[PDB]
């Protein structure tokens, strides 16, 4: 087999492995800022959301829960956080 150093894996190796099989566990989900159309208030939404997200100001449906990542509505703008 190809030689791999367990102490210093390359960045592309550890990004490819399963989240539980890395040296240290690290989730692949994240939080994002979404700006709905109609009113430009900013809402924080989890990427793998399981519930419909409604704007606090205008009560517009932002995202729909799916099997994996939540699907956003058309016309929205999203920013990865951190």
């Amino acid at each position: 087999p190809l030689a791999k150093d367990l102490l210093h894996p390359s960045p592309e190796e550890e990004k490819r492995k399963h989240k539980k099989k890395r040296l240290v566990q690290s989730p692949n989900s994240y939080f994002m800022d979404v700006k709905c159309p109609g009113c430009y208030k900013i809402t924080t939404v989890f990427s793998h959301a399981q519930t419909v997200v409604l704007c606090v100001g205008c009560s517009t449906v932002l995202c729909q829960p799916t099997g994996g990542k939540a699907r956003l509505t058309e016309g929205c703008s999203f920013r990865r956080k951190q």
Partner: protein, 149 residues
């Protein structure tokens, strides 16, 4: 290593190394607690309360922000559930299967599935008795189970 399934699943949550709250989080420890109280007053399970906070308010972990677990916070305010959540959900499943099984005499599979659910109920009941959550006289009866939940 599922108890009643030969396959071994690996799908689960993996917590990050960091235990510190994010800088963007504009909610305080006190503010989150009243959101928990309002969701509980609506009639939501603590597992479901954590889901709502994660999805909309950006609360990745309630324990990291407030310093206490969700169930411990609810007990302090007095919003303590009558029965443990996992036990209550398991008893709820048994009643629904039993109710269906009365109208379908020939359903052998539902009979077999009923045994497995009752086996988990008995095992969990003994463990909770050891932890003194339940009084040492609580028993699970098929007729009583409907009144229990």
């Amino acid at each position: 290593g599922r108890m009643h399934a030969p396959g071994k699943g690996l799908s689960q949550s993996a917590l990050p190394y960091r235990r510190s709250v994010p800088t963007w989080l504009k909610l305080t420890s006190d503010d989150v607690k009243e959101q928990i109280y309002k969701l509980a007053k609506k009639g939501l399970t603590p597992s479901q309360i954590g889901v709502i906070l994660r999805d909309s308010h950006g609360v990745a972990q309630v324990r990291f922000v407030t310093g206490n677990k969700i169930l411990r916070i609810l007990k302090s305010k007095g919003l303590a559930p009558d029965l443990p959540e996992d036990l209550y959900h398991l008893i709820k499943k048994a009643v629904a299967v039993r109710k269906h099984l009365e109208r379908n005499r020939k359903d052998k599979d539902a009979k077999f599935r009923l045994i497995l659910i009752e086996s988990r109920i008995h095992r969990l009941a003994r463990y909770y008795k050891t932890k003194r959550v339940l009084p040492p006289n609580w028993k699970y009866e098929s007729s009583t189970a409907s009144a229990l939940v």
